[PDB]
Symmetry: C2
Subunit: 163 residues, 2 copies
Amino acid sequence: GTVTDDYLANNVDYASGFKGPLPMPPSKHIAIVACMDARLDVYRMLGIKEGEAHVIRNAGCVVTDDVIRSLAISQRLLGTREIILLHHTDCGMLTFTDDDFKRAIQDETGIRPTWSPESYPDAVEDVRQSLRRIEVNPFVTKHTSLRGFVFDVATGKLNEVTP
Amino acid sequence: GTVTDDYLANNVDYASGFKGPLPMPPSKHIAIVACMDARLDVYRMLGIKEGEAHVIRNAGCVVTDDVIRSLAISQRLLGTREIILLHHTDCGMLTFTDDDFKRAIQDETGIRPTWSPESYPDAVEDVRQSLRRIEVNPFVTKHTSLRGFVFDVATGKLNEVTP
Ligand SMILES: [Cl-]
Ligand SMILES: [Mg+2]
Ligand SMILES: [Mg+2]
Ligand SMILES: [Zn+2]
Ligand SMILES: [Zn+2]
């Protein structure tokens, strides 16, 4: 028995009380960019219901090109117009540097990844940096609201960052 | 006000009942790669609790280099050893093609994106292609289980896909 097996069993119960289908476009025309961190239940954190919001998550809530791609699709094809960025306290990206992470992988595998690990030293600062990445990008321009926050993993509160 | 405003007010209530902080490493040592699709509440779909699992989401649940990066970090730094891949029915990626998407963006903005939109015609087949991407990648090699599923947006049920 794996965790996957357990989660599939959970899904049978989820399915038993499921109502659907809902429409594809987010009913609230909003996209959340968040971290993959195990301590972030994005839906409960923001009181989101099914069908309302796109949720995009990766290591460190980094505005990579994959995030730009997902946001471009979200706005242009599926009509979203708000963006929430969520970093958080005690994030894994503050605990290593890119050069160290790459060197370690190179030692084990013989090669260095071409991608940047995208670590950063300070979360508040990187929210500003991430907001700027979105502002400067010519493909994510349909939003009427772009706001960035740091989630406190000890209190559950969101604290806004000024760009 | 905006939806962001409403969602922030929702967080006040969330924060009132919060219990933390929890440890950084996923307590169930698992990573989920899923779609940003608004109809997918991944936590509830799999009966996930706070602190258990990394959840990564983009447009179309595509295994891009950002997903590879996030899995590499998840495994190497934070000890996850299982992967669940999660496509779904009525996916937005089935509704367009890459070339036409980029053509539209270029007509409107004067610029063509560097990134591939990464659309695909067949969700089940792309699960297989996604599993294959992970299996051949030299930077994500630690998992003891890698499984892919198609979430039915009409029933809430997961259907496993086999290579
Ligand atoms: Cl989520
Ligand atoms: Mg912009
Ligand atoms: Mg591999
Ligand atoms: Zn994090
Ligand atoms: Zn989708």
